[PDB]
């Protein structure tokens, strides 16, 4: 669980160094985007339910996982999805603010693909649910902010794959 300004206090520090011009050079780069990330995390908090409603209707309803026998049939199983998609849109918001994807694999990625295989959850439809969720998130926060929030979505999709 490290942010940007707290990953440079490990690298300038785990070997025992100080904060030279290169370490502060990235820190200044993070402070420049500090204004963009909060407004990105602002609108995502507002439209959390709307984004997840847009992603599932745009990608994984449409395909017989929603119908009987599919992986999402019963109401408990459907309700687990939007509960499950809420974490991806939420933890991705944390990575967008912290500027470092360490929180994702610390609290989301580890034991995740090993858990879906146990339950039999389709990883293919899950990645599509996050890719479509990444597509709507670029709608709200804009282009570059969507590039930032989108940079952690595919990090989840990559490791979850």
């Amino acid at each position: 669980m490290q942010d940007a300004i707290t990953s440079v206090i490990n690298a300038a520090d785990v070997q025992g160094k100080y904060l030279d011009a290169n370490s502060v050079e990235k820190l200044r780069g993070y402070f420049q985007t500090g204004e963009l990330r909060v407004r990105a995390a602002a609108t995502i908090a507002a439209n959390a339910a709307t984004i997840i409603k847009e992603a599932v209707a745009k990608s994984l309803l449409y395909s017989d996982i929603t119908r009987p026998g599919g992986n999402m049939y019963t109401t408990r199983r459907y309700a687990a999805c939007i509960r499950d998609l809420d974490y991806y849109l939420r933890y991705a918001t944390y990575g967008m603010l912290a500027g470092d994807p360490s929180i994702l694999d610390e609290r989301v990625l580890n034991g995740l693909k090993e858990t879906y295989n146990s339950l039999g959850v389709p990883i293919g439809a899950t990645i599509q649910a996050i890719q479509a969720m990444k597509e709507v998130t670029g709608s709200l926060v804009g282009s570059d902010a969507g590039k930032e929030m989108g940079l952690y979505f595919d990090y989840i999709c990559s490791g979850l794959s």
């Binding site: 389709p122 293919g124 439809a125 890719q131």
Partner: protein, 177 residues
């Protein structure tokens, strides 16, 4: 056999229709001549039960010392093993003709084959004759110029598929020489 092309998955809960990240570009481009290739492997494996009996008896009638007592194909354990090695070689050529590359031939079949035969006392100078009969047999089927069996096909050309399968049969024969 079923790795030799790349199919496509379309349903959900697959993990490859969505998250798989690749269509196999080197194998999506081998069905672009794939009807011509699947007829060519169909020429061999519908005659492979006749090809292995013709080639093994071809080197017996060209060298009669193998069925001599003291020869390497005298006993019934050894005559059955010599018929088994011809069919297994003919299947792995028909893998490499189907897959289009000789990687599967030189991994499962040819890797450590010259060291096997000189440890068992198998004569290598007679064994390459039995492969080279099957080199001459397989080009007659793919060009459909065999004498006593023809097969119906679609109209066209099948050179550089007989010439492709001649490039695997010497590759067997030089790996065991």
């Amino acid at each position: 056999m079923l790795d030799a092309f790349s199919r496509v998955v379309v349903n959900s809960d697959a993990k490859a229709a969505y998250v798989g990240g690749s269509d196999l570009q080197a194998l999506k481009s081998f069905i672009a001549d794939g009807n011509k290739r699947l007829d060519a492997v169909n020429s061999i494996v519908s005659n492979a039960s006749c090809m292995v009996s013709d080639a093994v008896s071809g080197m017996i009638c060209e060298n009669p010392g193998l069925i001599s007592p003291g020869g390497n194909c005298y006993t019934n354990r050894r005559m059955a093993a010599c018929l088994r090695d011809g069919e297994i070689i003919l299947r792995y050529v028909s893998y490499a003709l189907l897959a289009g590359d000789a990687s599967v031939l030189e991994d499962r079949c040819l890797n450590g084959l010259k060291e096997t035969y000189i440890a068992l006392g198998v004569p290598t100078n007679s064994s390459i004759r039995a492969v080279s009969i099957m080199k001459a047999q397989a080009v007659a089927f793919i060009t459909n110029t065999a004498t006593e069996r023809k097969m119906s096909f679609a109209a066209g050309d099948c050179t550089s598929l007989a010439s492709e399968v001649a490039s695997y049969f010497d590759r067997v024969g030089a790996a065991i020489s």
